[PDB]
Structure formats: C-alpha cells, structure tokens
Amino acid sequence: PPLSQETFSDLWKLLKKWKMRRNQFWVKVQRG
C-alpha cells in the first residue's frame, strides 16, 4: 500500500533504479 517512513520506505528504494529519471517527460533531460 501507499506509505513510506521507517519500513515500507526501505523498499520502494528498489524501484529507484527503475524509478529514477526514467519517468516520461523527465527521461534523459539532464546530464549524468
């Protein structure tokens, strides 16, 4: 479910590598 603090937040950190700037409008719109 939707929630991130001192637990469920420890995860989501996984989608990062896939949730990074890899969105739609901001997908490769900056150096790095």
Residues in the chain: 32
Amino acid residing at 7: T
**What technique determined this structure?**
NMR
What b-and-e string marks burial along 7-32, b requiring 16 or more CB atoms within 10 Å of the CB? Answer: eeeeeeeeeeeeeeeeeeeeeeeeee
4 touches 12 (CB < 8 A): yes
Q: Which residue type sits at 23?
A: N
- For CA atoms 9, 1, 14, 30, the dihedral sign is negative
CA of residue 31 relative to chain centroid, distance: 18
